[PDB]
Every structure is written in C-alpha cells, then in structure tokens.
C-alpha cells in the first residue's frame, strides 16, 4: 500500500464556505449512509482486499473517508476542489473495474445521488 492521501497541509491555503459546509453536512453525510457507500468509506487497502494491482493502475487514489476528513479539517479552498475529489473517487472505480461489475453498479448509483445533491448548491 502507498500512503493514503493527505488530510492536512499547513502551507495550503484554506477557506470555509457555505458550499463546503453543505458538501459536508448534506452531500457527504447523505452519501455516507447509502447502502452502497461502504466500499468507499476508507482508502483501498490493497493488501487486505488482495488487489495487488490496484495501485499499479490507480495513481490518484481517493475515498469518502479522506474526503470527510478533509472537509472536517478545513483542507479545501473551494467546493470545486472537493467535487473533484468525489469525481476522482468514482473515476478510479470505473478505471480499475469493468462495466457491469457489482462495485461499478455501486459507484454508478452513488455518483447519480452525488450529482443530484450538487445540482443546486447554496449561494
Ligand atoms: F476497495 C474498493 F474500493 F472496494 C474497490 N474498488 N475497486 C475494487 C475491485 C475489487 C474489490 N474487491 C474487494 C471485495 C469485493 C469483491 N467484490 C466486491 C463488490 C462490491 C464491493 C466490494 C467487493 N474492491 N474494489
Ligand atoms: Cl474562511
């Protein structure tokens, strides 16, 4: 396993915005409770899950546990940065797997719910 993505970086400029607060309170916390959220709540453990090629393929890993901790730690500058992390998470699942795989069906459902929630954001 490589080290997981950082959740703190003292030199990085940070900001609290209404949209980032909404991404944590509403978007993250709703997706987190979905029946399909569990594979995505922590970094992929390639040793535990016996996926020795996972990080041979996936070079920008991302997961909702990392996103949650970034949001709680005030890591982001803006909502778009956080949205990009969600998109990286979904894309990684699609890249490492194949259409029709159970885990891909899970990511597809979560991505549709994610887009539904970010379609309208607070001002
Ligand atoms: F680690 C991640 F994020 F779960 C993840 N991303 N791509 C993948 C590809 C395979 C995988 N095997 C872990 C156990 C498992 C076997 N069949 C499943 C069907 C749905 C969910 C988990 C599984 N886990 N995996
Ligand atoms: Cl601020």
mmCIF file of C-alpha atoms and ligand atoms in Angstrom:
data_model
loop_
_atom_site.group_PDB
_atom_site.id
_atom_site.type_symbol
_atom_site.label_atom_id
_atom_site.label_comp_id
_atom_site.label_asym_id
_atom_site.label_seq_id
_atom_site.Cartn_x
_atom_site.Cartn_y
_atom_site.Cartn_z
ATOM 1 C CA UNK A 1 0.000 0.000 0.000
ATOM 2 C CA UNK A 2 1.093 3.560 -0.681
ATOM 3 C CA UNK A 3 0.452 6.201 1.975
ATOM 4 C CA UNK A 4 -3.130 7.490 1.916
ATOM 5 C CA UNK A 5 -3.869 10.987 0.588
ATOM 6 C CA UNK A 6 -3.075 13.826 2.966
ATOM 7 C CA UNK A 7 -5.841 15.378 5.042
ATOM 8 C CA UNK A 8 -3.756 18.253 6.397
ATOM 9 C CA UNK A 9 -1.194 20.507 4.742
ATOM 10 C CA UNK A 10 -0.184 23.595 6.733
ATOM 11 C CA UNK A 11 1.118 25.518 3.710
ATOM 12 C CA UNK A 12 -2.041 25.022 1.668
ATOM 13 C CA UNK A 13 -4.473 27.971 1.762
ATOM 14 C CA UNK A 14 -7.828 27.010 3.231
ATOM 15 C CA UNK A 15 -11.262 28.548 3.286
ATOM 16 C CA UNK A 16 -14.606 27.931 4.919
ATOM 17 C CA UNK A 17 -17.501 28.498 2.514
ATOM 18 C CA UNK A 18 -21.228 27.811 2.659
ATOM 19 C CA UNK A 19 -20.843 25.381 -0.227
ATOM 20 C CA UNK A 20 -18.086 23.439 1.550
ATOM 21 C CA UNK A 21 -20.186 23.310 4.726
ATOM 22 C CA UNK A 22 -23.053 21.946 2.605
ATOM 23 C CA UNK A 23 -20.764 19.380 0.981
ATOM 24 C CA UNK A 24 -20.011 18.004 4.450
ATOM 25 C CA UNK A 25 -23.344 18.378 6.243
ATOM 26 C CA UNK A 26 -25.564 17.333 3.310
ATOM 27 C CA UNK A 27 -23.674 15.741 0.432
ATOM 28 C CA UNK A 28 -21.047 13.655 2.243
ATOM 29 C CA UNK A 29 -23.234 12.683 5.192
ATOM 30 C CA UNK A 30 -26.110 11.611 2.947
ATOM 31 C CA UNK A 31 -23.941 9.536 0.601
ATOM 32 C CA UNK A 32 -22.179 8.011 3.615
ATOM 33 C CA UNK A 33 -25.401 6.355 4.807
ATOM 34 C CA UNK A 34 -26.316 4.839 1.436
ATOM 35 C CA UNK A 35 -26.390 1.034 1.291
ATOM 36 C CA UNK A 36 -23.632 1.151 -1.350
ATOM 37 C CA UNK A 37 -21.315 3.592 0.455
ATOM 38 C CA UNK A 38 -19.283 1.051 2.452
ATOM 39 C CA UNK A 39 -16.576 0.166 -0.165
ATOM 40 C CA UNK A 40 -15.783 3.883 -0.455
ATOM 41 C CA UNK A 41 -15.595 4.932 3.214
ATOM 42 C CA UNK A 42 -11.830 4.356 3.539
ATOM 43 C CA UNK A 43 -8.755 4.188 1.295
ATOM 44 C CA UNK A 44 -8.489 0.996 -0.727
ATOM 45 C CA UNK A 45 -6.381 -1.424 1.291
ATOM 46 C CA UNK A 46 -4.780 -3.460 -1.482
ATOM 47 C CA UNK A 47 -3.097 -5.850 0.974
ATOM 48 C CA UNK A 48 -6.273 -6.529 2.952
ATOM 49 C CA UNK A 49 -8.516 -6.825 -0.104
ATOM 50 C CA UNK A 50 -5.960 -8.793 -2.151
ATOM 51 C CA UNK A 51 -5.823 -6.306 -5.032
ATOM 52 C CA UNK A 52 -2.074 -6.276 -5.722
ATOM 53 C CA UNK A 53 -2.558 -4.376 -8.985
ATOM 54 C CA UNK A 54 -4.843 -1.684 -7.528
ATOM 55 C CA UNK A 55 -2.125 0.921 -7.091
ATOM 56 C CA UNK A 56 -0.381 -0.343 -10.223
ATOM 57 C CA UNK A 57 -3.420 1.059 -12.035
ATOM 58 C CA UNK A 58 -4.799 3.813 -9.764
ATOM 59 C CA UNK A 59 -2.308 6.653 -9.336
ATOM 60 C CA UNK A 60 -4.567 9.303 -7.741
ATOM 61 C CA UNK A 61 -6.434 7.354 -5.034
ATOM 62 C CA UNK A 62 -9.409 8.958 -3.317
ATOM 63 C CA UNK A 63 -12.193 7.840 -0.999
ATOM 64 C CA UNK A 64 -15.001 9.311 1.072
ATOM 65 C CA UNK A 65 -13.188 8.797 4.386
ATOM 66 C CA UNK A 66 -10.386 11.019 3.099
ATOM 67 C CA UNK A 67 -12.952 13.497 1.753
ATOM 68 C CA UNK A 68 -14.790 13.545 5.110
ATOM 69 C CA UNK A 69 -11.561 14.208 6.998
ATOM 70 C CA UNK A 70 -10.530 16.917 4.527
ATOM 71 C CA UNK A 71 -13.907 18.621 5.000
ATOM 72 C CA UNK A 72 -13.748 18.296 8.799
ATOM 73 C CA UNK A 73 -10.154 19.613 8.804
ATOM 74 C CA UNK A 74 -10.870 22.651 6.602
ATOM 75 C CA UNK A 75 -8.480 21.310 3.943
ATOM 76 C CA UNK A 76 -10.190 22.731 0.856
ATOM 77 C CA UNK A 77 -10.189 26.201 -0.692
ATOM 78 C CA UNK A 78 -13.481 25.789 -2.557
ATOM 79 C CA UNK A 79 -16.315 23.393 -3.296
ATOM 80 C CA UNK A 80 -14.964 22.595 -6.752
ATOM 81 C CA UNK A 81 -11.813 21.141 -5.201
ATOM 82 C CA UNK A 82 -13.935 18.784 -3.080
ATOM 83 C CA UNK A 83 -16.201 17.888 -6.019
ATOM 84 C CA UNK A 84 -13.057 16.983 -7.981
ATOM 85 C CA UNK A 85 -12.114 14.530 -5.196
ATOM 86 C CA UNK A 86 -15.523 12.851 -5.490
ATOM 87 C CA UNK A 87 -15.078 12.632 -9.253
ATOM 88 C CA UNK A 88 -11.616 11.105 -8.817
ATOM 89 C CA UNK A 89 -13.090 8.513 -6.447
ATOM 90 C CA UNK A 90 -15.790 7.470 -8.914
ATOM 91 C CA UNK A 91 -13.431 7.518 -11.910
ATOM 92 C CA UNK A 92 -10.918 5.315 -10.061
ATOM 93 C CA UNK A 93 -13.579 2.675 -9.514
ATOM 94 C CA UNK A 94 -14.506 2.737 -13.207
ATOM 95 C CA UNK A 95 -10.845 2.537 -14.265
ATOM 96 C CA UNK A 96 -9.874 -0.385 -12.043
ATOM 97 C CA UNK A 97 -13.002 -2.406 -12.895
ATOM 98 C CA UNK A 98 -15.377 -3.043 -15.838
ATOM 99 C CA UNK A 99 -18.951 -2.157 -16.808
ATOM 100 C CA UNK A 100 -21.430 -4.422 -15.057
ATOM 101 C CA UNK A 101 -19.229 -5.270 -12.063
ATOM 102 C CA UNK A 102 -21.037 -5.143 -8.719
ATOM 103 C CA UNK A 103 -18.710 -2.442 -7.405
ATOM 104 C CA UNK A 104 -19.254 -0.392 -10.565
ATOM 105 C CA UNK A 105 -23.039 -0.619 -10.146
ATOM 106 C CA UNK A 106 -22.491 0.705 -6.622
ATOM 107 C CA UNK A 107 -20.352 3.622 -7.793
ATOM 108 C CA UNK A 108 -22.864 4.427 -10.550
ATOM 109 C CA UNK A 109 -25.692 4.699 -8.041
ATOM 110 C CA UNK A 110 -23.620 6.833 -5.672
ATOM 111 C CA UNK A 111 -22.485 9.102 -8.496
ATOM 112 C CA UNK A 112 -26.071 9.726 -9.586
ATOM 113 C CA UNK A 113 -27.028 10.560 -5.995
ATOM 114 C CA UNK A 114 -23.959 12.801 -5.711
ATOM 115 C CA UNK A 115 -24.868 14.716 -8.874
ATOM 116 C CA UNK A 116 -28.463 15.016 -7.697
ATOM 117 C CA UNK A 117 -27.236 16.599 -4.457
ATOM 118 C CA UNK A 118 -24.766 19.039 -6.087
ATOM 119 C CA UNK A 119 -27.151 20.084 -8.866
ATOM 120 C CA UNK A 120 -28.161 23.050 -6.687
ATOM 121 C CA UNK A 121 -25.806 24.383 -4.031
ATOM 122 C CA UNK A 122 -26.249 27.222 -1.542
ATOM 123 C CA UNK A 123 -25.065 30.691 -2.515
HETATM 124 F F1 LIG B 1 -11.726 -1.325 -2.419
HETATM 125 C C1 LIG B 1 -12.798 -0.966 -3.183
HETATM 126 F F2 LIG B 1 -12.986 0.374 -3.189
HETATM 127 F F3 LIG B 1 -13.890 -1.605 -2.678
HETATM 128 C C2 LIG B 1 -12.625 -1.408 -4.631
HETATM 129 N N1 LIG B 1 -12.528 -0.640 -5.729
HETATM 130 N N2 LIG B 1 -12.399 -1.480 -6.817
HETATM 131 C C3 LIG B 1 -12.440 -2.735 -6.370
HETATM 132 C C4 LIG B 1 -12.357 -4.092 -7.093
HETATM 133 C C5 LIG B 1 -12.430 -5.301 -6.303
HETATM 134 C C6 LIG B 1 -12.583 -5.216 -4.861
HETATM 135 N N3 LIG B 1 -12.661 -6.390 -4.039
HETATM 136 C C7 LIG B 1 -12.931 -6.163 -2.632
HETATM 137 C C8 LIG B 1 -14.036 -7.113 -2.195
HETATM 138 C C9 LIG B 1 -15.169 -7.188 -3.226
HETATM 139 C C10 LIG B 1 -15.368 -8.250 -4.097
HETATM 140 N N4 LIG B 1 -16.479 -7.989 -4.853
HETATM 141 C C11 LIG B 1 -16.987 -6.776 -4.457
HETATM 142 C C12 LIG B 1 -18.240 -5.978 -4.968
HETATM 143 C C13 LIG B 1 -18.564 -4.657 -4.336
HETATM 144 C C14 LIG B 1 -17.702 -4.116 -3.258
HETATM 145 C C15 LIG B 1 -16.504 -4.891 -2.782
HETATM 146 C C16 LIG B 1 -16.172 -6.277 -3.441
HETATM 147 N N5 LIG B 1 -12.666 -3.941 -4.190
HETATM 148 N N6 LIG B 1 -12.588 -2.688 -5.015
HETATM 149 CL CL1 LIG B 2 -12.534 31.202 5.539
#
